PDB file of C-alpha atoms and ligand atoms in Angstrom:
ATOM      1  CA  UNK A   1       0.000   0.000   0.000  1.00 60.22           C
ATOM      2  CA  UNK A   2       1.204   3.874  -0.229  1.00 59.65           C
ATOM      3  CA  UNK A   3       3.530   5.358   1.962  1.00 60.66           C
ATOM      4  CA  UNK A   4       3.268   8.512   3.736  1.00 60.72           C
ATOM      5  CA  UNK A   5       4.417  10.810   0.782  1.00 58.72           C
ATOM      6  CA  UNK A   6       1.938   9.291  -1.821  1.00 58.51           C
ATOM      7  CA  UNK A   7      -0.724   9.161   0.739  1.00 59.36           C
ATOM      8  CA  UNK A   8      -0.001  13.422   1.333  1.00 63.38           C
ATOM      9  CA  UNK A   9      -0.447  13.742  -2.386  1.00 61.89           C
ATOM     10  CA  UNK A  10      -3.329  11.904  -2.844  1.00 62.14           C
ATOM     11  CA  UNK A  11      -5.174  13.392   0.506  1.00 66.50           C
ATOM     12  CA  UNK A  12      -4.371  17.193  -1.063  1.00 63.22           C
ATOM     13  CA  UNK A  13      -6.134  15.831  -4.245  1.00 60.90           C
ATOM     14  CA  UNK A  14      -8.849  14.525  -2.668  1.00 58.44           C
ATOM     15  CA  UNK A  15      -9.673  17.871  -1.323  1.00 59.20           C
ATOM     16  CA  UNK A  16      -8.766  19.954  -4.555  1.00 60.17           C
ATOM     17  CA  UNK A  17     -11.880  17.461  -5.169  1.00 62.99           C
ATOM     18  CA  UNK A  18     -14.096  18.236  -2.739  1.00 61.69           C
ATOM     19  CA  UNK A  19     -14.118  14.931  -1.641  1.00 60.04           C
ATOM     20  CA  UNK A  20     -14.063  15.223   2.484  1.00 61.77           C
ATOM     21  CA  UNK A  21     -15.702  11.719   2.814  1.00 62.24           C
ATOM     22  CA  UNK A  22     -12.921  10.010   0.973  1.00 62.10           C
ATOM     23  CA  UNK A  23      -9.771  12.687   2.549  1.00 63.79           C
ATOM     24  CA  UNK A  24     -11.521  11.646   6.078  1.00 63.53           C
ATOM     25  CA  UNK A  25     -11.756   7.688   4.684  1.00 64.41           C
ATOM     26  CA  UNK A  26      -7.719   7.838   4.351  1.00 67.23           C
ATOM     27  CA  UNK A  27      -7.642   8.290   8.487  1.00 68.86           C
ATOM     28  CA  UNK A  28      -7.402   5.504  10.796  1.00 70.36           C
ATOM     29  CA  UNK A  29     -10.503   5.177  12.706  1.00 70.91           C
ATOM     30  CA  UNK A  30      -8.224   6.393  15.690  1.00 70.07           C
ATOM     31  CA  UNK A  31      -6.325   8.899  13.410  1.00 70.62           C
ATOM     32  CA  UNK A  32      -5.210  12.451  14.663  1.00 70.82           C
ATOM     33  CA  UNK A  33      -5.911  15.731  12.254  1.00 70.73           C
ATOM     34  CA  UNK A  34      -3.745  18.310  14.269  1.00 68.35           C
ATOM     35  CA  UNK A  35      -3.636  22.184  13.422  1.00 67.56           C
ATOM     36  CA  UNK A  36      -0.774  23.562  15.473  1.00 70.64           C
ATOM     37  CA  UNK A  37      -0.625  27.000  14.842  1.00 73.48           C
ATOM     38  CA  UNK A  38      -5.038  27.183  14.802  1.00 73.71           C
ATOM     39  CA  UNK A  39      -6.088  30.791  16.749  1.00 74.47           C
ATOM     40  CA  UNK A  40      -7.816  30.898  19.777  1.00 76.60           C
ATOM     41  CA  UNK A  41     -11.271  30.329  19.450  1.00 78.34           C
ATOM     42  CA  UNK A  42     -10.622  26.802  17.523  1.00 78.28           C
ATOM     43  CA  UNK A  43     -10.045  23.387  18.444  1.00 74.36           C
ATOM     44  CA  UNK A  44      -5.956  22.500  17.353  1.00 75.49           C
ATOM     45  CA  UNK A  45      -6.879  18.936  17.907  1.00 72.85           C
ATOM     46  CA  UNK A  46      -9.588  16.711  16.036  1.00 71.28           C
ATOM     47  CA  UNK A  47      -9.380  12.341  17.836  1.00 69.68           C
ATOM     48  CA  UNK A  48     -10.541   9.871  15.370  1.00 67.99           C
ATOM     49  CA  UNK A  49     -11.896   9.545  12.061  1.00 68.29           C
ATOM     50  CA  UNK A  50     -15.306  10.503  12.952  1.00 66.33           C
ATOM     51  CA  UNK A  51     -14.375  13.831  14.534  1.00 65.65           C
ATOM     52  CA  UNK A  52     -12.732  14.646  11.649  1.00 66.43           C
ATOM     53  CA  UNK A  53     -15.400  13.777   9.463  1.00 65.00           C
ATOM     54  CA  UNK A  54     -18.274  16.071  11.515  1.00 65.28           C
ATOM     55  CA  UNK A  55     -15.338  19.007  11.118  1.00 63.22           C
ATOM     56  CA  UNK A  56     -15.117  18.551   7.551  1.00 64.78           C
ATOM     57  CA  UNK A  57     -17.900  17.468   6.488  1.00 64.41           C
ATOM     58  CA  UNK A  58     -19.486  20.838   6.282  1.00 66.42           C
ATOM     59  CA  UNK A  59     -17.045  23.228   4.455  1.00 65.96           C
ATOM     60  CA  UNK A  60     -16.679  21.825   0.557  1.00 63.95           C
ATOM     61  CA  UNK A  61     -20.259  23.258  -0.224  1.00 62.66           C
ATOM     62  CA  UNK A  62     -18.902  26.846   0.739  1.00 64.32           C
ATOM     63  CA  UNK A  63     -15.220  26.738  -0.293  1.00 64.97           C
ATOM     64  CA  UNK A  64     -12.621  25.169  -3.180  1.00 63.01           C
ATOM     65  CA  UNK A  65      -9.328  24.453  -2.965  1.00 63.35           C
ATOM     66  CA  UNK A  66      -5.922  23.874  -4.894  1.00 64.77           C
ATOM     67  CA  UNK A  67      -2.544  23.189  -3.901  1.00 64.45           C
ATOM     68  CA  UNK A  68       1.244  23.760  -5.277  1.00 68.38           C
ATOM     69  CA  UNK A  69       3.605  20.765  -5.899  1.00 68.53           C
ATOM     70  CA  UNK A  70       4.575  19.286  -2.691  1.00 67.23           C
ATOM     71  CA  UNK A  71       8.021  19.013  -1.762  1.00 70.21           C
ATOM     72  CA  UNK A  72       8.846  16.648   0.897  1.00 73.79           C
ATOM     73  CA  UNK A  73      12.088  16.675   3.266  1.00 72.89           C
ATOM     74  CA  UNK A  74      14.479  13.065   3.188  1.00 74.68           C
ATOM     75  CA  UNK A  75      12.378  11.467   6.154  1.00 75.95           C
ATOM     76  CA  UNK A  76      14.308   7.912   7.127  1.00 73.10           C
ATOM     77  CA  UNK A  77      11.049   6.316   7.692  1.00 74.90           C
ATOM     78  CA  UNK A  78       8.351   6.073   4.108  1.00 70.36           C
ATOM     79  CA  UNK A  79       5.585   6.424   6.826  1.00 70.19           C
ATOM     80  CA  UNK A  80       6.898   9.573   7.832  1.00 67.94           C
ATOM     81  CA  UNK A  81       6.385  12.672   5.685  1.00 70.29           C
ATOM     82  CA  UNK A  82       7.120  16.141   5.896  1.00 70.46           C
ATOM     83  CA  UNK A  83       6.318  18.559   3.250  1.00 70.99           C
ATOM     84  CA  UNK A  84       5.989  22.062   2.449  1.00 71.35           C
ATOM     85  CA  UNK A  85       3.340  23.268   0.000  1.00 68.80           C
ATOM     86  CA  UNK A  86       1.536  26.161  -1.407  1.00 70.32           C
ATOM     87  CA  UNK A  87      -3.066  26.616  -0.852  1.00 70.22           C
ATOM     88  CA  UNK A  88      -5.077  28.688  -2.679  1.00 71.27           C
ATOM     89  CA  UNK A  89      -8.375  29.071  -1.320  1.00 71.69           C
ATOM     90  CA  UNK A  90     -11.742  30.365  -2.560  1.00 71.94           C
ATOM     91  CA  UNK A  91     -14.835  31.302  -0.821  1.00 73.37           C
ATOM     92  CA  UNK A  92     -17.713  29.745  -3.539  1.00 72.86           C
ATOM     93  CA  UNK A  93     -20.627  32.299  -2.470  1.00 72.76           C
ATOM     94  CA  UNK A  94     -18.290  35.469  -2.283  1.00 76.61           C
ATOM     95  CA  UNK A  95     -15.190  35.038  -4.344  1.00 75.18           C
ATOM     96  CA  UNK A  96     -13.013  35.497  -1.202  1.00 72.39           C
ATOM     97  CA  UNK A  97      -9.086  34.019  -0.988  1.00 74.71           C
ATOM     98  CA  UNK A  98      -6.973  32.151   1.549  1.00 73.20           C
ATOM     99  CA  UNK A  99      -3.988  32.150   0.869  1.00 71.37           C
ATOM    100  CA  UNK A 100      -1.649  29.764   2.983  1.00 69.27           C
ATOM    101  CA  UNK A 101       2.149  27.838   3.149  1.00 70.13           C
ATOM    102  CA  UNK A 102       2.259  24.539   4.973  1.00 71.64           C
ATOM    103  CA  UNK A 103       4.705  22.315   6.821  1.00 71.36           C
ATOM    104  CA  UNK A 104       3.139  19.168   7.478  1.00 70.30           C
ATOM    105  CA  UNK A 105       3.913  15.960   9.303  1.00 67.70           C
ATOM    106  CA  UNK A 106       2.523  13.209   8.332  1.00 69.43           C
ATOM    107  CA  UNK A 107       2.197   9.627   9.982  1.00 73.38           C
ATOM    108  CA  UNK A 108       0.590   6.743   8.421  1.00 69.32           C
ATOM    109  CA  UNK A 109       0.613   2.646   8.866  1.00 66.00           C
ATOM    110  CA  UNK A 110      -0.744   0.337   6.149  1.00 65.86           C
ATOM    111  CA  UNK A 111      -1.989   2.934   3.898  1.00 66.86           C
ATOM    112  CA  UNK A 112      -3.841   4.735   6.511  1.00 65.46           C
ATOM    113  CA  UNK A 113      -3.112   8.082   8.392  1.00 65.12           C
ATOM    114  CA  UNK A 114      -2.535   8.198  12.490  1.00 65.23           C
ATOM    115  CA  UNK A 115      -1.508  11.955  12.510  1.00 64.13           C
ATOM    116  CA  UNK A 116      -2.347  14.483   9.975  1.00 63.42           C
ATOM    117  CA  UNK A 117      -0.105  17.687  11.819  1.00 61.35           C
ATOM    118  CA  UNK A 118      -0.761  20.789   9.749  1.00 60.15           C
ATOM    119  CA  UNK A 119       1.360  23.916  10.774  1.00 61.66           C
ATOM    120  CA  UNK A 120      -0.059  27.400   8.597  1.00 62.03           C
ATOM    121  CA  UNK A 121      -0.187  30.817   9.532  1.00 60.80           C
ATOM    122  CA  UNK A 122      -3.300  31.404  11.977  1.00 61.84           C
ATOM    123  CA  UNK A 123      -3.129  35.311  10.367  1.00 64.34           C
ATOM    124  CA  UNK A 124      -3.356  34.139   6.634  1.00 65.30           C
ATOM    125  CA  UNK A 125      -6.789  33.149   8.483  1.00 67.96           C
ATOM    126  CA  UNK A 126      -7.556  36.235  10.180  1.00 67.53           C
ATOM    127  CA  UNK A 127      -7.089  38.359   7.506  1.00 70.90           C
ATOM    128  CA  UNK A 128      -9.471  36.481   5.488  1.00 70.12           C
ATOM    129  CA  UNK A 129     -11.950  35.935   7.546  1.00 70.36           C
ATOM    130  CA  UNK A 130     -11.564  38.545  10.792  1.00 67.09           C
TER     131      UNK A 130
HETATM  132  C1  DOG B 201     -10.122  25.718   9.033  1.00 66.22           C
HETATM  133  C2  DOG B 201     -10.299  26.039   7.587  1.00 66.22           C
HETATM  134  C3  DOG B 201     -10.151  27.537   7.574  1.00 66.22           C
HETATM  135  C4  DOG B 201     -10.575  28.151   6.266  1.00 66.22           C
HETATM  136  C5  DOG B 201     -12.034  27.827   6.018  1.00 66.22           C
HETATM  137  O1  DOG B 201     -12.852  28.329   7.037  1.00 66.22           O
HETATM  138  C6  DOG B 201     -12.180  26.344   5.960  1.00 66.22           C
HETATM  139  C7  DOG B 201     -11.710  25.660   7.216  1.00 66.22           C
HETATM  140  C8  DOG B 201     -11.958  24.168   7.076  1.00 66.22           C
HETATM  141  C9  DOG B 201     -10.814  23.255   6.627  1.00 66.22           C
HETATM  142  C10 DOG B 201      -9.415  23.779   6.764  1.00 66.22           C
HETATM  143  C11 DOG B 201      -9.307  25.297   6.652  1.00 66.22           C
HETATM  144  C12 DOG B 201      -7.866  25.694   6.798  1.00 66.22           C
HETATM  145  C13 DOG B 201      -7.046  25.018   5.712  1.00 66.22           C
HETATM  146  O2  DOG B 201      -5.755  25.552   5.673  1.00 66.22           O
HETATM  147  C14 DOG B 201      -7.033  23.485   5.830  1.00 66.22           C
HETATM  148  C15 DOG B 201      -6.316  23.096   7.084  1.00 66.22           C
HETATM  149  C16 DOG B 201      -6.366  22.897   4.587  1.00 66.22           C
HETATM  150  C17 DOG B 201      -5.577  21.609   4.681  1.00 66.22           C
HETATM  151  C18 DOG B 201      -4.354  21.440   4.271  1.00 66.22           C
HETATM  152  C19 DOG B 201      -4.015  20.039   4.358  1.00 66.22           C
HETATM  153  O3  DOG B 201      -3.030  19.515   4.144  1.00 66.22           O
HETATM  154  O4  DOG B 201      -5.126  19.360   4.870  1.00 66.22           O
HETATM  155  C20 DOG B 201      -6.149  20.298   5.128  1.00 66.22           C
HETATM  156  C21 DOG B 201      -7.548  22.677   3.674  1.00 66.22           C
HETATM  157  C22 DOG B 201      -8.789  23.125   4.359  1.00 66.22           C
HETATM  158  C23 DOG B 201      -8.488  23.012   5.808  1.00 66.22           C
HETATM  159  O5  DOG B 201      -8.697  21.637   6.023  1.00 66.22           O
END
Protein backbone atom coordinates (compact mmCIF):
# COMPACT_ATOMS: atom_id res chain seq x y z
CA UNK A 1 0.00 0.00 0.00
CA UNK A 2 1.20 3.87 -0.23
CA UNK A 3 3.53 5.36 1.96
CA UNK A 4 3.27 8.51 3.74
CA UNK A 5 4.42 10.81 0.78
CA UNK A 6 1.94 9.29 -1.82
CA UNK A 7 -0.72 9.16 0.74
CA UNK A 8 0.00 13.42 1.33
CA UNK A 9 -0.45 13.74 -2.39
CA UNK A 10 -3.33 11.90 -2.84
CA UNK A 11 -5.17 13.39 0.51
CA UNK A 12 -4.37 17.19 -1.06
CA UNK A 13 -6.13 15.83 -4.25
CA UNK A 14 -8.85 14.53 -2.67
CA UNK A 15 -9.67 17.87 -1.32
CA UNK A 16 -8.77 19.95 -4.55
CA UNK A 17 -11.88 17.46 -5.17
CA UNK A 18 -14.10 18.24 -2.74
CA UNK A 19 -14.12 14.93 -1.64
CA UNK A 20 -14.06 15.22 2.48
CA UNK A 21 -15.70 11.72 2.81
CA UNK A 22 -12.92 10.01 0.97
CA UNK A 23 -9.77 12.69 2.55
CA UNK A 24 -11.52 11.65 6.08
CA UNK A 25 -11.76 7.69 4.68
CA UNK A 26 -7.72 7.84 4.35
CA UNK A 27 -7.64 8.29 8.49
CA UNK A 28 -7.40 5.50 10.80
CA UNK A 29 -10.50 5.18 12.71
CA UNK A 30 -8.22 6.39 15.69
CA UNK A 31 -6.33 8.90 13.41
CA UNK A 32 -5.21 12.45 14.66
CA UNK A 33 -5.91 15.73 12.25
CA UNK A 34 -3.75 18.31 14.27
CA UNK A 35 -3.64 22.18 13.42
CA UNK A 36 -0.77 23.56 15.47
CA UNK A 37 -0.63 27.00 14.84
CA UNK A 38 -5.04 27.18 14.80
CA UNK A 39 -6.09 30.79 16.75
CA UNK A 40 -7.82 30.90 19.78
CA UNK A 41 -11.27 30.33 19.45
CA UNK A 42 -10.62 26.80 17.52
CA UNK A 43 -10.05 23.39 18.44
CA UNK A 44 -5.96 22.50 17.35
CA UNK A 45 -6.88 18.94 17.91
CA UNK A 46 -9.59 16.71 16.04
CA UNK A 47 -9.38 12.34 17.84
CA UNK A 48 -10.54 9.87 15.37
CA UNK A 49 -11.90 9.55 12.06
CA UNK A 50 -15.31 10.50 12.95
CA UNK A 51 -14.37 13.83 14.53
CA UNK A 52 -12.73 14.65 11.65
CA UNK A 53 -15.40 13.78 9.46
CA UNK A 54 -18.27 16.07 11.51
CA UNK A 55 -15.34 19.01 11.12
CA UNK A 56 -15.12 18.55 7.55
CA UNK A 57 -17.90 17.47 6.49
CA UNK A 58 -19.49 20.84 6.28
CA UNK A 59 -17.04 23.23 4.45
CA UNK A 60 -16.68 21.83 0.56
CA UNK A 61 -20.26 23.26 -0.22
CA UNK A 62 -18.90 26.85 0.74
CA UNK A 63 -15.22 26.74 -0.29
CA UNK A 64 -12.62 25.17 -3.18
CA UNK A 65 -9.33 24.45 -2.96
CA UNK A 66 -5.92 23.87 -4.89
CA UNK A 67 -2.54 23.19 -3.90
CA UNK A 68 1.24 23.76 -5.28
CA UNK A 69 3.60 20.77 -5.90
CA UNK A 70 4.58 19.29 -2.69
CA UNK A 71 8.02 19.01 -1.76
CA UNK A 72 8.85 16.65 0.90
CA UNK A 73 12.09 16.67 3.27
CA UNK A 74 14.48 13.07 3.19
CA UNK A 75 12.38 11.47 6.15
CA UNK A 76 14.31 7.91 7.13
CA UNK A 77 11.05 6.32 7.69
CA UNK A 78 8.35 6.07 4.11
CA UNK A 79 5.59 6.42 6.83
CA UNK A 80 6.90 9.57 7.83
CA UNK A 81 6.38 12.67 5.68
CA UNK A 82 7.12 16.14 5.90
CA UNK A 83 6.32 18.56 3.25
CA UNK A 84 5.99 22.06 2.45
CA UNK A 85 3.34 23.27 0.00
CA UNK A 86 1.54 26.16 -1.41
CA UNK A 87 -3.07 26.62 -0.85
CA UNK A 88 -5.08 28.69 -2.68
CA UNK A 89 -8.37 29.07 -1.32
CA UNK A 90 -11.74 30.36 -2.56
CA UNK A 91 -14.84 31.30 -0.82
CA UNK A 92 -17.71 29.75 -3.54
CA UNK A 93 -20.63 32.30 -2.47
CA UNK A 94 -18.29 35.47 -2.28
CA UNK A 95 -15.19 35.04 -4.34
CA UNK A 96 -13.01 35.50 -1.20
CA UNK A 97 -9.09 34.02 -0.99
CA UNK A 98 -6.97 32.15 1.55
CA UNK A 99 -3.99 32.15 0.87
CA UNK A 100 -1.65 29.76 2.98
CA UNK A 101 2.15 27.84 3.15
CA UNK A 102 2.26 24.54 4.97
CA UNK A 103 4.70 22.32 6.82
CA UNK A 104 3.14 19.17 7.48
CA UNK A 105 3.91 15.96 9.30
CA UNK A 106 2.52 13.21 8.33
CA UNK A 107 2.20 9.63 9.98
CA UNK A 108 0.59 6.74 8.42
CA UNK A 109 0.61 2.65 8.87
CA UNK A 110 -0.74 0.34 6.15
CA UNK A 111 -1.99 2.93 3.90
CA UNK A 112 -3.84 4.74 6.51
CA UNK A 113 -3.11 8.08 8.39
CA UNK A 114 -2.54 8.20 12.49
CA UNK A 115 -1.51 11.96 12.51
CA UNK A 116 -2.35 14.48 9.98
CA UNK A 117 -0.11 17.69 11.82
CA UNK A 118 -0.76 20.79 9.75
CA UNK A 119 1.36 23.92 10.77
CA UNK A 120 -0.06 27.40 8.60
CA UNK A 121 -0.19 30.82 9.53
CA UNK A 122 -3.30 31.40 11.98
CA UNK A 123 -3.13 35.31 10.37
CA UNK A 124 -3.36 34.14 6.63
CA UNK A 125 -6.79 33.15 8.48
CA UNK A 126 -7.56 36.24 10.18
CA UNK A 127 -7.09 38.36 7.51
CA UNK A 128 -9.47 36.48 5.49
CA UNK A 129 -11.95 35.93 7.55
CA UNK A 130 -11.56 38.54 10.79
C1 LIG B 1 -10.12 25.72 9.03
C2 LIG B 1 -10.30 26.04 7.59
C3 LIG B 1 -10.15 27.54 7.57
C4 LIG B 1 -10.58 28.15 6.27
C5 LIG B 1 -12.03 27.83 6.02
O1 LIG B 1 -12.85 28.33 7.04
C6 LIG B 1 -12.18 26.34 5.96
C7 LIG B 1 -11.71 25.66 7.22
C8 LIG B 1 -11.96 24.17 7.08
C9 LIG B 1 -10.81 23.25 6.63
C10 LIG B 1 -9.41 23.78 6.76
C11 LIG B 1 -9.31 25.30 6.65
C12 LIG B 1 -7.87 25.69 6.80
C13 LIG B 1 -7.05 25.02 5.71
O2 LIG B 1 -5.76 25.55 5.67
C14 LIG B 1 -7.03 23.48 5.83
C15 LIG B 1 -6.32 23.10 7.08
C16 LIG B 1 -6.37 22.90 4.59
C17 LIG B 1 -5.58 21.61 4.68
C18 LIG B 1 -4.35 21.44 4.27
C19 LIG B 1 -4.02 20.04 4.36
O3 LIG B 1 -3.03 19.51 4.14
O4 LIG B 1 -5.13 19.36 4.87
C20 LIG B 1 -6.15 20.30 5.13
C21 LIG B 1 -7.55 22.68 3.67
C22 LIG B 1 -8.79 23.12 4.36
C23 LIG B 1 -8.49 23.01 5.81
O5 LIG B 1 -8.70 21.64 6.02
Amino acid sequence: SMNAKEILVHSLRLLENGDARGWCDLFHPEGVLEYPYAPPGWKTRFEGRETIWAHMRLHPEHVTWRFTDVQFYETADPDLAIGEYHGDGVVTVSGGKYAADYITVLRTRDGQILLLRVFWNPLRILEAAG
